[PDB]
Ligand binder design. Sequence first.
Ligand code: CLA
Ligand code: CLA
Ligand SMILES: CC1=C(/C=C/C(C)=C/C=C/C(C)=C/C=C/C=C(C)/C=C/C=C(C)/C=C/C2=C(C)CCCC2(C)C)C(C)(C)CCC1
Ligand SMILES: CC1=C(/C=C/C(C)=C/C=C/C(C)=C/C=C/C=C(C)/C=C/C=C(C)/C=C/C2=C(C)CCCC2(C)C)C(C)(C)CCC1
Ligand SMILES: CC1=C(/C=C/C(C)=C/C=C/C(C)=C/C=C/C=C(C)/C=C/C=C(C)/C=C/C2=C(C)CCCC2(C)C)C(C)(C)CCC1
Lengths: 329, 317
Amino acid sequence: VQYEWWAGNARFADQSGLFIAAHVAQAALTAFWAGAFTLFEISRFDPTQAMGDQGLILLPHLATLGWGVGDGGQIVDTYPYFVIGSIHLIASAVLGAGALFHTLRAPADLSTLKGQGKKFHFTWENPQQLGIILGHHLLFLGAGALLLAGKAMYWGGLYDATTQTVRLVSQPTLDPLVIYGYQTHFASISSLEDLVGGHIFVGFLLIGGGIWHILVPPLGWAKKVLLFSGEAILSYSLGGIALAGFVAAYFCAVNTLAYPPEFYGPPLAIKLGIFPYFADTVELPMHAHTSRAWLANAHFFLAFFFLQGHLWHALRALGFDFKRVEQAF
Amino acid sequence: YEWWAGNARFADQSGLFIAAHVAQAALTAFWAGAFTLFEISRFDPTQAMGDQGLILLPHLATLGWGVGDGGQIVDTYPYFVIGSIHLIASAVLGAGALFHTLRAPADLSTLKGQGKKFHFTWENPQQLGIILGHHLLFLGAGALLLAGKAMYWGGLYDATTQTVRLVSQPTLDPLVIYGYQTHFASISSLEDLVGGHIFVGFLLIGGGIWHILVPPLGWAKKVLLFSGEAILSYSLGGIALAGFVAAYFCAVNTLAYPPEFYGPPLAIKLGIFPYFADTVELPMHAHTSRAWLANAHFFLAFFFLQGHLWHALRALG
Ligand code: CLA
Ligand code: CLA
Ligand SMILES: CC1=C(/C=C/C(C)=C/C=C/C(C)=C/C=C/C=C(C)/C=C/C=C(C)/C=C/C2=C(C)CCCC2(C)C)C(C)(C)CCC1
Ligand SMILES: CC1=C(/C=C/C(C)=C/C=C/C(C)=C/C=C/C=C(C)/C=C/C=C(C)/C=C/C2=C(C)CCCC2(C)C)C(C)(C)CCC1
Ligand SMILES: CC1=C(/C=C/C(C)=C/C=C/C(C)=C/C=C/C=C(C)/C=C/C=C(C)/C=C/C2=C(C)CCCC2(C)C)C(C)(C)CCC1
C-alpha cells in the first residue's frame, strides 16, 4: 500500500529503526519543553505576588514536590528549580542524541543486524518479545514510582498543604484494605501521608507486573480477546492515556491537597455549557485563569480528543475503513 | 572542486593540511597581537573600558597585568609587550606556513628521514589518537600555565573587593567541582575559579596521557565515521556548543571578569531572533563590549552549528 505525504508516518509500522527514532525524538521534544520552558518562564515569576494569579504553568509542579518552599508557603529561591531544569536540559540533549542517531545512522530493519540488534527486532504478531518490552517499560515506570517513594524519605519529604510544612513522611500503611475503600474517598482523604503510602503499593504493583510480563508471555486467551496490530495496540494505549488524562483533569479540579491551593489556585467548579469545563470560584478580569483551570480544562480536552483518536484507530484496526457509503441507495 | 570548494583539494593530500593550519594559527595570533596594538592607541583612561568598545585589553585586565586598585589603569606597557610577543609569534608561524607550502612536499610519503612518522591518513586510528593526545597535552600545559600565572607568577583581579589579589587556598575537593554544573553561569567566587582550573588542568593532562599512552580500542570505529569531514563535523559541533555556552557565559557572568571593564550586565531578548541588549544607553548608539562579544559569539556559534550540520549531512548518506 501507499500513503500520501500529508499522512505518511504509517511507514513506521514495518520499519523498526524509524519506529524507535521518532518516538525517542518525541520524548526529546517533551524533555526540551520541560527544560527550556522552565528556564524561559522564570522571568514571569515574582515571589511578592501569588503563584495562582500570574499564570505560572511549569513551576507549580516543581513547588508541588517541596524543593524551594518552607513555612507559610513562600518561595525564597530558584536554585532547586535551576538544577532540575538543567538536568532536564542535559537529559533532552542525550535523548535527542540517541534519537537523531537512530534517525540518521542506525538501520531501519533491526532484524538485518549482526550483534545485539537482530535479537531486538520487533513485529506485530508475537506475544513474547512485545511482552518483554511491556515488562521492561513496567520496570521503568515502577522505578519512577520508587523515585516518588524515595522523595518522601531522602530530601526531607513531600510538601504538605494542610500543615504548611515540608515534612518527612515515615509512616507507611501496612494494610491494603484501606486501598480498597479509597474509591469513594478520591481526592478527599485530607491527609498527605496516605498518598505516599498508596504510592508504595502501586509501585510494588508495577514491579510485580513487570516481573510477570518478563517471566511469562500471554498464555493464550490474549490471542483471542485482544489484537496485536499496530492500530489496535495504538487504540489500547490511547484509551489508557485518555483515562489517565481524564483522571488527571479530575485531580486538577477537585483535590487541592497534592496540588497546593495557595500555589496552583482555588478549588474549581464543574460546569457545562456547550462543552463541559471547570471554572474558578474567584474569576480574573484580564481574560486570565489560574493554573488549576488551565491544566484541568486542557487535559480534559486533550483526553477527549485522544479518546476520539482511540476510536479512530479502533475503527481502522477492525476493518471499518469506509462502510457508511451504503446508507443511500 | 573548481574555485568554490578549493580548500577540499588538499584534504586527501595531507601534506599541505599542516601549512593551512599553521597559516590559520598565524592569522589568529596576528589578529590578537595587532588588535591589542590597535586598541592601545584608541584607549581612554578616564572613560570606562566597556563604553568605548574594548575587548582584548579587558581580557588582559582579568589576568591583572596593566591594572591596579580601584578599576583604573596603571600603564599600557604589559599589554604592549604581550601583543608584541604575539606578533612575533605570528611572524614565525607565518614563516613556518610559507615553509610548509614551499619546501615541504605535497605528500609526506616521499620523506625518508626522521619525519616519516608525521604522515597521517583517514584510515588508521592510532595516528590521530597520538595527535589528539599531544594537543590535549598542550591544552593541559596551557591550564598549568594559568596555574603558574595564578600562583607563582602573579595575581588576579577580583570583582568583589576591586583589587589585584594573589589568590591562595584554592579548591581542593572534587565534590563542589562536580556541583558547579548546577551554578556555572555564576561562579560567585574567584578562588573556586582558580581551584577548578587547577582541577581541570589535572583532568585534561590525565586525559592527554591516557590518549597518547593508550591506542584506540576499536569500539568507536564501528560507530563513529573515520573520515576527514566526519572528524571536522565532530570538532565543529564541539566548538559550536562551546561557543554557545561561552556566549551565555558572557551574557550573565559579571564576576568571572569584573564588569567595569565591560559595562552593565547583559539582558536576554527572545523574539523572532535571540539577541542580548543592555540597560543603559550610549550617545553613539553603540553597544557595550560585552554586548558585542556575547551577541557575536552567539551568532557565530549558531552558524557553526549549521556548518557542522551541513558537514555531517555531507559525511553521511
Ligand atoms: C499517540 C498518538 C497517535 C499516533 C501515533 C497516531 C498515528 C497515526 N495516525 Mg492518528 N490520531 C491521533 C493520535 C495518534 N495518531 C488522535 C488523538 C487523533 C484524533 C485527533 C488522530 C486522528 C487521526 C486521523 C483522522 C487519521 C490519523 C492517521 C494516522 C496514521 C498516519 C500517520 C499520521 O499520523 O498522519 C500524519 C498527519 C498529520 C501530521 C496531519 C497533517 C497536518 C495537520 C493539518 C496539522 C495538525 C492539525 C492540528 C489542528 C494542528 C494544531 C495542533 C493543536 C494541538 C494546537 C498514523 C499511524 C491517518 C490514518 O489512518 O492513516 C492514513 C488518518 O486519516 N490519525
Ligand atoms: C573551521 C570550520 C570550517 C572548516 C574547516 C570548513 C571546511 C570546508 N568547508 Mg565549510 N562551513 C563552515 C565551517 C568550516 N568549513 C561553516 C560554519 C559553514 C556554514 C556557513 C560552512 C559551509 C560550507 C558549505 C556550504 C560548503 C563548505 C565546504 C567546505 C570544504 C571546502 C571549502 C572551500 O574551499 O570552499 C568553501 C568556499 C569558499 C572558501 C569561498 C566562499 C567563502 C566566502 C568568500 C566567505 C565569506 C564570509 C565572510 C568573509 C565572513 C563574514 C564574517 C564577519 C565576521 C566578517 C572544506 C573542507 C564546501 C564543501 O563541502 O565542498 C563541496 C561547501 O560547499 N562549507
Ligand atoms: C491508593 C492510593 C493511590 C493509588 C492508586 C492506585 C493503586 C490505583 C490503581 C488503579 C487500578 C489498579 C486500576 C485498574 C483499572 C482497570 C481497568 C481500567 C481495566 C480495564 C480493562 C480492559 C478495558 C480490558 C477488558 C477486556 C478484557 C479483559 C477481555 C475482553 C475484552 C476487554 C478488552 C473489554 C494514589 C496514588 C492515588 C494515592 C492515594 C491512595
Ligand atoms: C599558505 C597560504 C596563504 C596564507 C598565508 C598567510 C595569510 C600568511 C600570514 C602571515 C602573517 C600573518 C604574517 C605576519 C607578519 C607580521 C609582521 C612581521 C609584523 C611585524 C610586527 C611585529 C612582529 C612587531 C611589533 C611591533 C613592536 C614590537 C614595536 C612597535 C612596532 C610594532 C607594533 C611593529 C594564503 C591564504 C595567502 C594563500 C594560500 C597559501
Ligand atoms: C563549572 C565550572 C567549571 C567546570 C567545568 C568543567 C569541569 C566542565 C566539564 C564538562 C564536561 C566534562 C563536559 C562533557 C561534555 C561531553 C559532551 C558534550 C559529549 C556529548 C556527546 C554526544 C552528545 C554524542 C553522543 C555519542 C557518543 C558519546 C558515542 C557515539 C554515538 C554518539 C555520537 C551519539 C570550572 C572548573 C571551569 C570553573 C567553575 C565553573
